[PDB]
With several copies, the nearest count.
Chain A
Amino acid sequence: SLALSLTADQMVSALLDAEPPILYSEYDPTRPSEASMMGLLTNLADRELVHMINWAKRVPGFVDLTLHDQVHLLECAWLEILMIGLVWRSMEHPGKLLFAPNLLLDRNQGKGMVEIFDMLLATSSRFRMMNLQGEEFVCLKSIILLNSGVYTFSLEEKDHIHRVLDKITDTLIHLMAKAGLTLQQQHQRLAQLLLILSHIRHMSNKGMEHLYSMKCKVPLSDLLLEMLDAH
């Protein structure tokens, strides 16, 4: 409710003002290894999660959902959202991943970690070639939040979610018609953007099982463990 009454411009503004800050890592240079890097990424992701949760609440429609439903959506999409956030801010850094303003990495240092790094780099290149706009990005990210767990949790309820997704789709199209794209180009770019979400899912799934494996071996946040032991 209410979220289904927003205009496209109001939808965009809402998402833009809801944007979480870009956090710094505890990265202290003059000293390079594995585990240490994973520790920094864990420390970073831990603090980002708190902002993501508060960001998720500002996402139009999300607040209207059950507490249990909110939990499930975040449990499914948290790494996807972290990764598309990483990929987005890494756009103007070709061949590099900007985890934090003070933590810029290429595929060299990140050496199964390498496979995920290349997939993230490939997504960032794809965004750069597509010349992804910030208005489009915040749409994609909020789509991930609502879509990633909609087929895992008479309640529905899931009809409301689909109604909001349709609203974001209209928002995306509104943005593309604004940038002078023809109707054909609007459909194509829309398709291009949503097909990347498949690979963002793929990277998350791959990253998820990587975190699962080392859990039996680096220390993880009590919130991050909460996320992992729920997927």
Chain B
Amino acid sequence: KILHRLLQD
């Protein structure tokens, strides 16, 4: 889930 990227960055 690419949405998990950015959201934990």
Whether A and B touch (Cβ < 8 Å) is answered with yes
CB of A226 within 8 A of CB of B1, answer: yes
Instruction: Pick from A56, A67, A230: contact of B8, CB below 8 A.
Output: A67
A-B contact count (CB 8 A): 27
Tell me the minimal C-beta distance from A149 to chain B in angstroms: 13
> Which of the 9-residue segments A68-76, A80-88, A115-123 touches chain B?
A68-76
User: Does A23 reach chain B (CB closer than 8 Å)?
Assistant: no
Q: Please, how many residues of chain B have a CB less than 8 angstroms from a CB on the other chain? A: 7
User: Does A177 reach chain B (CB closer than 8 Å)?
Assistant: no
Q: Is the contact region of chain A dominated by helix, strand, or loop, or is it mixed?
A: helix
Q: Which residues of B contact A226 (CB under 8 A)?
A: 1-3
Q: Is the contact region of chain B dominated by helix, strand, or loop, or is it mixed?
A: loop
Chain A to chain B contacts (Cβ below 8 Å), 17 pairs: A50-B6, A53-B3, A53-B6, A53-B7, A67-B4, A67-B7, A70-B7, A71-B7, A74-B3, A74-B7, A75-B3, A223-B2, A223-B3, A223-B6, A226-B1, A226-B2, A230-B1
The 10 closest A-B pairs by CB, nearest first: A53-B6, A223-B2, A226-B2, A226-B1, A226-B3, A71-B3, A70-B7, A222-B2, A53-B7, A67-B7
7 A-B pairs besides A54-B6, A71-B3, A74-B7 with CB distance below 8 A are: A67-B4, A71-B7, A74-B3, A222-B2, A223-B2, A226-B3, A230-B1
